[PDB]
């Protein structure tokens, strides 16, 4: 059988953007197997070994002026440049979420009613889902499955609300997302 040892090498250039392109930070990092050995942080200005394994590299790369100069300018020529190029289909990409409300198939404790607010197919991942009972927000009894990234530029999430239904009550699920100018609401008529 195939039992040979594996040896992995990863190289990552991370461009972190704050307030659009106002504040930009480049983090270049080398990782041997699962160990990051050396990195170039634009905030530091030079390579720094992360573990003894990376020491020879930080030393050798820092002695190369053309390399260091290129690395120091990448925040502009690399990061800001690629941000400008992809902004229209990434930062500005927007897909409205599909929202539906129905009681959970679970319903553990009897005289109750676990409600489920399903929000799916949206982008970006930033979103706010709230539950309301007669216009007033529900603080307790709210449970979420968390934000799920589908890997296809779409997200989904389930937010439950344990209730003690009273004929005539209106439980509203409110969703605020960059795709809509006004919040989306779906009501459950108890």
């Amino acid at each position: 059988g195939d039992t040979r040892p594996r040896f992995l090498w990863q190289l990552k250039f991370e461009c972190h953007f704050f307030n659009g392109t106002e504040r930009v930070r480049l983090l270049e990092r080398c990782i041997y197997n699962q160990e990051e050995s050396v990195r170039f942080d634009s905030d530091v200005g030079e390579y720094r070994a992360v573990t003894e394994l990376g020491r020879p590299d930080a030393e050798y790369w820092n002695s190369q002026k053309d390399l260091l100069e290129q690395r120091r300018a990448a925040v502009d020529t690399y990061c800001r440049h690629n941000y400008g190029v992809g902004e229209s289909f990434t930062v500005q990409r927007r897909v409205e979420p599909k929202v539906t409300v129905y009681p959970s198939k679970t319903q553990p404790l009897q005289h109750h009613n676990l409600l489920v607010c399903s929000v799916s197919g949206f982008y970006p991942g930033s979103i706010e889902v709230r539950w309301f009972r007669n216009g007033q927000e529900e603080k307790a009894g709210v449970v979420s499955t968390g934000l799920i990234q589908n890997g296809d530029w779409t997200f989904q999430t389930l937010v439950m609300l344990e209730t003690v239904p009273r004929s005539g009550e209106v439980y509203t699920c409110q969703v605020e997302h960059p795709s809509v100018t006004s919040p989306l609401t779906v009501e459950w008529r108890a």
Binding site: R4, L8, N33, G86, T90, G125, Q149, G151, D152, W153
Partner: protein, 179 residues
């Protein structure tokens, strides 16, 4: 509030090489090292931008040379296998006979090599299935997505069968219309 990552890797002895760009966790594109071309995650991206694939091929050759140097420098310290967390979900609330897609999420694992198979009623399914390349993680492990478009029914049950050197036995995540 936004992170763009250019992630690359070379794995010996498999000779696996990968070059991709990531936007807030979602793949923008990767380069097909064999056909030597850019593969946009979503078709329309390619109409808004371009990437010279050959640049990924130049980098990959440097990444391999460095892997060799580092392999020797660590005294041939091999990687520790970390088995994947596997989850199966649909990309939207399932409704009978309502077109949906099964998602097999393979996460937190390394090295980046896995064998994934879909099973419908204990039988391998090939039709319509697709998959992503290996995606990066802050902890330097990897993520991966495998998809299977399907038509829900109480008669069909599915299993995402995952193999990895970190798993002593193949892992099968079952799925069925829970009602």
């Amino acid at each position: 509030e936004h992170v763009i990552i250019q992630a690359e890797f070379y794995l010996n002895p498999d000779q696996s090489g990968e070059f991709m760009f990531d936007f807030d966790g979602d793949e923008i594109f990767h380069v097909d090292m064999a056909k030597k071309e850019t593969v946009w995650r979503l078709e329309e991206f390619g109409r808004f931008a371009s990437f010279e694939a050959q640049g990924a091929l130049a980098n990959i050759a440097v990444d391999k040379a460095n892997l060799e140097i580092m392999t020797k420098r660590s005294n041939y310290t091999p990687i520790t296998n970390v088995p994947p967390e596997v989850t199966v979900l649909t990309n939207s609330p399932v409704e009978l006979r309502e077109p949906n897609v099964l998602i097999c999420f393979i996460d937190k694992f390394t090295p980046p090599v896995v064998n994934v198979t879909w099973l419908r009623n204990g039988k391998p399914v090939t039709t319509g299935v697709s998959e992503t390349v290996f995606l990066p993680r802050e902890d330097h492990l990897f993520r991966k997505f495998h998809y299977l478009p399907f038509l829900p029914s109480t008669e069909d049950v599915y299993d995402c069968r995952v193999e990895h050197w970190g798993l002593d036995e193949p892992l099968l995540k079952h799925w069925e219309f829970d009602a």
